[PDB]
Structures are given as structure tokens and as C-alpha cells.
Design a protein around this ligand. Sequence first.
Ligand SMILES: COc1cc(OC)c2c(=O)[nH]c(-c3cc(C)c(OCCN4CCCC4)c(C)c3)nc2c1
Length: 127
Amino acid sequence: SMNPPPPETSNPNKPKRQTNQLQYLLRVVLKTLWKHQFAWPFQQPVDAVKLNLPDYYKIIKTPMDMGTIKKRLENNYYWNAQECIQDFNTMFTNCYIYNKPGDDIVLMAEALEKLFLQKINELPTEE
Ligand SMILES: COc1cc(OC)c2c(=O)[nH]c(-c3cc(C)c(OCCN4CCCC4)c(C)c3)nc2c1
């Protein structure tokens, strides 16, 4: 069994910026979710080999996780807040697509997503 390579976190070809919205995504959004009791399954790529989920990357063709998002924010990968918000939504959607209502992982994702929605509702206007 084999995991795919992780998503890209560095790419000198990619355009990027620092902005106040991206700062908020790191300081407020990511750090709020990261510290939550239910964060840990989402803090790194799904290890389908050790978890014995051999169909994971058959179903999930755009993997995403908060470890990747953390690296992207720390490494100034993004051009805008949309790109980062999309990564969070990909992560949640993957979980919902792969699993079933009521699964522990789905309940965990929902708790994180609740907080995500609350924080992104107060994303500041661009400076
Ligand atoms: C450690 O980090 C992660 C991260 C993840 O996503 C971010 C996932 C993920 O999406 N799914 C699962 C996962 C989900 C279920 C339902 C599952 O089944 C339990 C037993 N079954 C229930 C009923 C009959 C028997 C098993 C073995 C694994 N594990 C993950 C682990």
C-alpha cells in the first residue's frame, strides 16, 4: 500500500502575497481549529496505509488537511484568502464524501467546521 505525495506547500512559480485577510486566516482561523480537541485527525495528510483505508485516495482525489494549510500559511503560499478558505472546505468535504453520517470523524469535522464558519463570518475587509 502507498500514500500519494502530499499536496504542494512550496512552489516558487506560484504567485503569493501577505494580506490582512491571510493574517486572520492564520492567527484566528487556523489557530482556533488547530487547538480544538478534535483537530488531531486533520493535522496531517490521511495515512491510508497505516489506517488501512486502501480506497481513500480512489475516492478523494483532492486531499487536504490542516497540516498542509498550516504550512501554506506559514510559508506564504497563498495569493488570497479565497484560496485558503477553499482548502479548508476541501478538507471538510473530503471527510463528508468519504465517510457516513454519524461517524466519529464526521462529528469531529462538523465541530471544526462550525468554528470555521463562525470565524470566517468575521473575516475583515481587505486593507
Ligand atoms: C487518524 O486520522 C484520520 C483522518 C481521517 O480523515 C481526516 C479519517 C477518515 O476520513 N476516516 C477514517 C475512518 C472512518 C471510519 C468510519 C472507520 O471505520 C470505523 C469502523 N467501522 C465503523 C462501522 C463498521 C466498522 C475507520 C476505520 C476509519 N479514519 C480517519 C482517520
